[PDB]
């Protein structure tokens, strides 16, 4: 509705924030002129006590583990991609999994779950230079100046970037399962007229963006 | 030096991580090609848990409260902006207060700790009516709705630059916060940590200059 007021509080991880949200915002706006959000930082390990006491209407995150008695659902699946400034050595060609294991690596917004289930994947191929891990690629974007590294980040946030910041998207060169994203919520939210809708827009939004 | 191929764990804030660090980065890498870097969220609450207990070397924010025994040293000079989009009514012409209470707010990378001296600074005054915030900008850049994106100053200048919108002051008396470095008094005398302060600090430094002028 657009009689709608009240201001929803999403708990999101950092990458939730770059992609899902503001995909999803020009739609929630124009729908509902007039709801007000609040977008906190996702503490993964304090993940039902935001929902439970300190006010979040919504968590849009994975899970580190289950979170019954919290009601959840999945978004999709998100995939990994790499990032390299166009002035990258590897550019140009395409990247054998040699290429990825010989330079530097940025980790941008991937998060240790992912981290360990990337790290899984890598599990006997040589130890790769770590070089940066960060949730702003802002800050991966300093170096491309400095050292050939390669930037990892979940598939979504290399197709809102990289077609701006002037950088090349290349696929992983190794078996990535793609791993689920979720919502989470306090089942007090559960038939909330307000939070059903919500849930129902940000739910219809990841269609959307993850069909295109 | 630059045999250093150690890591650094630095707990920091959003404006941090996208006006400070990204501007120190390259000199660091540079005088220590080695070197390795970990960048996490700080929470604000848990500042001190984190450099304790988490693994965090060094922390940069503001600071809630007091840090004891914490050790701490100011950086410098945070202040508040507001960006708006080209196409805004107020774009083209001065910002009065008046008009700054009429607009939807979408307030972006401040920290509750400032969010308090803001509202603190605004206490006599009509509510705004508060429609976004977020952390990242993304997400106001998303509905630039005739909002008014109030920003940490620095921030303000290095998006409002490229995402081409407009930097209007705040309509009101705000004095600038102060950002810092906190760390652990285990880190205070590791040859590592004194040094990664002092390239935070002199770039720091350097950065206040280059905006200065």
Known sequence: PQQC????????????????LPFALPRIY???????????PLQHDRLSDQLTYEGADLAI??????????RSEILGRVGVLCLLSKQH????????LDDYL?????????????????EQALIDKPQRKMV???????????????????????????????????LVVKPLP?????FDYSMIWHARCEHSPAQEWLR?????ECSRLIAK
Do not use: W
């Open 200 to 204: 129902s827009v940000v739910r219809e």
């Open 132 to 166: 940066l891990r960060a949730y702003h690629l802002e800050a991966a974007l300093a170096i491309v100046d400095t050292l050939p590294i390669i930037i990892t980040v979940p598939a979504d946030l290399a197709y809102l970037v990289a077609e701006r910041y002037d």
């Open 61 to 70: 995150c994975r899970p580190t583990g289950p979170v019954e008695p919290l």
């Open 30 to 40: 124009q729908e509902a002129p007039n709801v007000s959000f609040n977008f906190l």
């Open 89 to 96: 050595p590897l550019a140009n060609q395409e990247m054998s």
């Open 102 to 118: 010989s330079h530097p690596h940025a980790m941008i917004a991937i998060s240790d779950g992912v981290k360990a289930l990337i």
């Open 174 to 178: 190794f078996q990535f399962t793609p």
């Open 5 to 20: 007021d009240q201001t929803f509080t999403i708990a999101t991880t950092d990458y939730a924030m770059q992609t899902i």
